Amino acid sequence: TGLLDGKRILVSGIITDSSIAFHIARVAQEQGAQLVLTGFDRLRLIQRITDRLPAKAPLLELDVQNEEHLASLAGRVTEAIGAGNKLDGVVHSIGFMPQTGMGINPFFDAPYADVSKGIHISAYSYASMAKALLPIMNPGGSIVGMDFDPSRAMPAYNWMTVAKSALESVNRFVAREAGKYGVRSNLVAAGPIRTLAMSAIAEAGAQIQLLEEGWDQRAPIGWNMKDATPVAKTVCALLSDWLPATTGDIIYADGGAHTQLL
Amino acid sequence: TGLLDGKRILVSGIITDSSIAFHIARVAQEQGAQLVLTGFDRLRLIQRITDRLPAKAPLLELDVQNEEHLASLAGRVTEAIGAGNKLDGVVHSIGFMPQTGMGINPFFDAPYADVSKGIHISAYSYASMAKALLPIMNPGGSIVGMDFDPSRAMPAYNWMTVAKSALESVNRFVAREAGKYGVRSNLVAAGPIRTLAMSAIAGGALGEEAGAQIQLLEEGWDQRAPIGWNMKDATPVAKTVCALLSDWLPATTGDIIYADGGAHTQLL
Amino acid sequence: TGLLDGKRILVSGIITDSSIAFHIARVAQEQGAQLVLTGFDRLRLIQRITDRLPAKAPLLELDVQNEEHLASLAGRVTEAIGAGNKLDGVVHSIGFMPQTGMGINPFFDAPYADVSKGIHISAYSYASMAKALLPIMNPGGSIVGMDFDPSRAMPAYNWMTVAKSALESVNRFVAREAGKYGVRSNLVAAGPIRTLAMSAIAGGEAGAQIQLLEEGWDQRAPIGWNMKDATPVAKTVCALLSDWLPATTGDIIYADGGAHTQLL
Amino acid sequence: TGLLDGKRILVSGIITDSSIAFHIARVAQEQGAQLVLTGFDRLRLIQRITDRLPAKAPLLELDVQNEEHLASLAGRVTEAIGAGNKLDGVVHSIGFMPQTGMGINPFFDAPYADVSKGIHISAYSYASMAKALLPIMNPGGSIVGMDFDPSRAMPAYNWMTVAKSALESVNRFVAREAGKYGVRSNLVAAGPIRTLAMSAIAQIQLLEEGWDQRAPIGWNMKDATPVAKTVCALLSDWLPATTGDIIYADGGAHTQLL
Ligand SMILES: NC(=O)c1ccc[n+]([C@@H]2O[C@H](COP(=O)([O-])OP(=O)(O)OC[C@H]3O[C@@H](n4cnc5c(N)ncnc54)[C@H](O)[C@@H]3O)[C@@H](O)[C@H]2O)c1
Ligand SMILES: NC(=O)c1ccc[n+]([C@@H]2O[C@H](COP(=O)([O-])OP(=O)(O)OC[C@H]3O[C@@H](n4cnc5c(N)ncnc54)[C@H](O)[C@@H]3O)[C@@H](O)[C@H]2O)c1
Ligand SMILES: NC(=O)c1ccc[n+]([C@@H]2O[C@H](COP(=O)([O-])OP(=O)(O)OC[C@H]3O[C@@H](n4cnc5c(N)ncnc54)[C@H](O)[C@@H]3O)[C@@H](O)[C@H]2O)c1
Ligand SMILES: NC(=O)c1ccc[n+]([C@@H]2O[C@H](COP(=O)([O-])OP(=O)(O)OC[C@H]3O[C@@H](n4cnc5c(N)ncnc54)[C@H](O)[C@@H]3O)[C@@H](O)[C@H]2O)c1
Ligand SMILES: CCCCCCc1ccc(Oc2ccccc2C)c(O)c1
Ligand SMILES: CCCCCCc1ccc(Oc2ccccc2C)c(O)c1
Ligand SMILES: CCCCCCc1ccc(Oc2ccccc2C)c(O)c1
Ligand SMILES: CCCCCCc1ccc(Oc2ccccc2C)c(O)c1
Ligand code: NA
16 A cells, blocks of 8 residues: 555655655655655754654764765665665755845855855755765665756746756766666656745745746646645655656656646 | 555557557556546457456447547446546547658658648547546546657657647646646656557668668667666556556646656767 | 848748738848748738838749649749749748637637648648748758747647647758758747737637736846837848858747746 | 947957857957957967957956956956947857866766866856946847757766756846846857867767767868857847847757657
8 A cells, every 4th residue: 555665765855844855754654665864954953853754764964065974874874774775765855055046136146155055955966965875775766856947047046046957957967877776866846835945035025926826827736835745745656666767857746837838 | 555546547549458558557457447448440359459458447439530439438438437436537548640641751741631630639639538538537637648759850750740749739738628627637758669550660661761760769768768768668658657647646737757768868 | 231132032921011921021121132922812912011011022822721832832933033043041921720729719629620720721831831942942041930939838829839839840850851952940939929810819808818928928038028029030030041040950949038938 | 241240249268269269259250240358277378369360359368267357357348348338249158177077987976176166167157257247238239158958968978067057047047137238148059069178078070970960951060160150140130039048059950869
């Protein structure tokens, strides 16, 4: 009855119980998956938000800008799931951009240092996580990252749009590497979801508002910006065996908004 | 406990046991779905092939160019699944293009009457099946059609490519209509699979120039696909379609899912 | 001096002086092109309108659904431009969709016979025109058709959207053929322009939603958009007819103010 | 008579006379444009090379990673074209990626500092150059960047593919900014051309065969002129409704699977 039955999956990116990662985790566990979680910085609070998941799961520290964490990550994951076991799934649900690269801050005024930090964490880290975790993944496995359609420019998102454009490209190359291990690599492009990070993006509020209302309007089946579950289920679909021929790709979990002009 | 358990699903397009629709049907039954089948022309022969499926399934006649078949379709489906029951799934796995519109035949020499028949059967019928069946579909339901990536031109496929481009555009509009029934509409873009249709194009008149190009095309899929592509295995495609028939892609509509080994994401 | 100096170019699609084709012809003539025009159905009326262009141009009858018109087109064009001369450019600026395939008419209620006539005129005719004219075109020549971005679905445009998706695909195959003659094939995807065909998309609400798209277009466009000025689109078509886009084929150039590149 | 007659256009990225920017500059001058050129690193050699252009032109130093070069750029440009005169066109023909992010070097072994430098020079600089130069550009003006279609992954191009993907995203936001000045921003995605940087990536003639094949009108790696003319097209008044966009000067190869 479990879609992810018997699969060992690493899930990064939980910060609150609003986090897309948190809901990915909950739905995965409901579908029989065995998880390992990773958190950044506030492991104290995170450890406790994750206590509210349907089942218990080891929590490892991972700062994707930290070379030492990455070098040790595979070892620490192995310790947590038991030697002789490998990952079946990896969820990258990590993103960051300094305030200067978002909101009403002029596009031209974000210093490259700030952009580079945003691109490091939001795009490059998809590959560096892949580099760490592929040596301990089973054939038939699946890596899934979170995307926000960057095909067109828009207000407020600014340099985070550029980061997602890089991430989409990095994804297609990770797929080439991941293919050597019989592993898939894909992105899920979600509609706007009210999260902690969503909260930080913000005149700029007027625009975000109008964008959101637009999404629900264009989407032929509507879009509930307060429900993370359909996005969570999409990510789990990709972690399962039921999309076995899809890789280097992007699945849109956006109510179909991107397929409609008006 | 099965992916499609308790779902009632119509599956069109079986003609041989190599048909993509045959494998869609088999995997759906393995996952607990209850099927209605539609078939065109050689119904006696199709019943023998559908007899090979794991589970029983009623076989209705449907020529998508027949207005009466389409007008009577919903009523014949209702009769087969019992009144008060609706469908949760529809699979469109139907294609046709006259020989003039494909293969070694010069692109410019396909008469429009031929092209128009191909587009009717291959693209327009997705809308008219949706029109006939949406009134007997449940919310949360899902329509799926079969695609072959037409974003770039290529040898041989010729006017079928134009048909598929039209199909993709039709799908985005079918999704607006289906939206009102709480129903999703998507396409699955498959890599090449060895079916009646496909072998017919290579074996076709090819044994000439288009022959080598087609084979070069086919062998390129496996080469570009980061995880490989096996033309003799339709199951990765059937599963993907089942994934769209299920509740596990609930926020995807008007869209295309690529079941091609990731080949379309790679230039070499 | 002129961008199209010495080029001989066929332009289809003029019905009124609001026609995109009319403005293409004008700018082409201002830039030194010698034109052959083709018109459908109302030829005496069309001559009255093409009289208003800066220069003379033979007017041929061409109904793209008429195999005999296509069969004779090359011969007739060759007589208009004189012995030893060939075409350098062809403009397809032709479209049609019956009222069932557009506006507030339900998408599902359009019979295939109507949809098929629309696709015949709007997409397939691109290929049969290239078929007719490629044998009398010069290496380095250019064929251009008019497009409206169909990558996403939208209110009112309906089955014409499907026709344009077909056209884009046909263009990529026409480029394969044209390339055997050294000829380019491309489309121009224009933003909304106030023409006769545009008038007919609604009826008597579709009119509302079209105004809504209209207003959103100028908004989305980083350089804005004026639906009453065909000239930027005309210039774009002339750019492709010229030698200044010599490595572009089977492709689409967007003359839409950049609107398609912006979400909001 | 000339397509760019009387327009003032800045062209960056010349390093040898095979540079795509060299040929952009040559064709632009042949079309009556008045140029300002910028150069990186080998200024003395570059000067030697721009002497081979059809007309003389001011050479200014610009390392796009140098905040002071960027801060002074507009002033130095106005000094060259004379106060009261503004630019009509800007050409960005600049890129770089460390050898760890390219070739047969494993994708996963390129350190972020290497990737970050490449993105800085190849993607961010398009924005930062526009920020410097938009305040001194005329309405009707045109900014043009060089692209290599990154919509699909491929061998060897590796992390530069990612840079190009970012560049395409950046171009779309620059267009938002440039619209306020009545200025357009677009990219030219070119087919492969035999340049110095092309040489740095390492079959090199095996690549020319494939492209030429797929291109319905063929493709010559030894000829940058069709790419130059395209850029000059975007600099002209003849594509006045195109912005935030990409024009493919690749022989049509990206429209074809085989
Ligand atoms: N919420 C949306 O609408 C939406 C839409 C599309 C895509 N996304 C993407 O989904 C992913 C998750 O974002 P979210 O919406 O759930 O917000 P979130 O704030 O809940 O999660 C962001 C996560 O990034 C992590 N982060 C920042 N720096 C990190 C670092 N050095 N190392 C490890 N983790 C770090 C945070 O700890 C945090 O857990 C992101 O990639 C986001 O861009 C979100
Ligand atoms: N085989 C491949 O490699 C491949 C790849 C991508 C997409 N597709 C698409 O998959 C779908 C099925 O094709 P296939 O490969 O399984 O071959 P197929 O020959 O088994 O399927 C074709 C089906 O369409 C039906 N058909 C033709 N005319 C019809 C009509 N008037 N009414 C109803 N049905 C009609 C046939 O009866 C037949 O069952 C098609 O849409 C095809 O274009 C196939
Ligand atoms: N107006 C816009 O906003 C817009 C935008 C994008 C693309 N387009 C396209 O531009 C092209 C020209 O359309 P328009 O906007 O100038 O309107 P239009 O009404 O002026 O042009 C339509 C033309 O198609 C011709 N036509 C119809 N049936 C024909 C047939 N059998 N044979 C030959 N010609 C036939 C008409 O005679 C007429 O000259 C069309 O392809 C249109 O789809 C228009
Ligand atoms: N040659 C091709 O096949 C091809 C194809 C498509 C796109 N492009 C792009 O065209 C543009 C020109 O490349 P090219 O092939 O002519 O190679 P090139 O080596 O001749 O020119 C590249 C330029 O980048 C400049 N560069 C590197 N770092 C710089 C810095 N800090 N500041 C300023 N300039 C710097 C070099 O000085 C050099 O002039 C590039 O953007 C390239 O990515 C090239
Ligand atoms: C125009 C604004 C877009 C609408 C909301 C969608 C969204 C919300 C949150 C996202 O996560 C981040 C955004 C910026 C920086 C960091 C993160 C994790 C994110 O990547 C996308
Ligand atoms: C030229 C490239 C070779 C690979 C094509 C793969 C393929 C195979 C069969 C397909 O189905 C049809 C194709 C044409 C006509 C009818 C059908 C069902 C189809 O649509 C696609
Ligand atoms: C909601 C959509 C409204 C904006 C569309 C702009 C437009 C205007 C006219 C066009 O030409 C035709 C449209 C339909 C049928 C025939 C033609 C030539 C055309 O193809 C596009
Ligand atoms: C994988 C196929 C081979 C690619 C050939 C085309 C090309 C050649 C040179 C290019 O310029 C650069 C490439 C890398 C780093 C820096 C520059 C300027 C460039 O961006 C693109
Ligand atoms: Na070729």
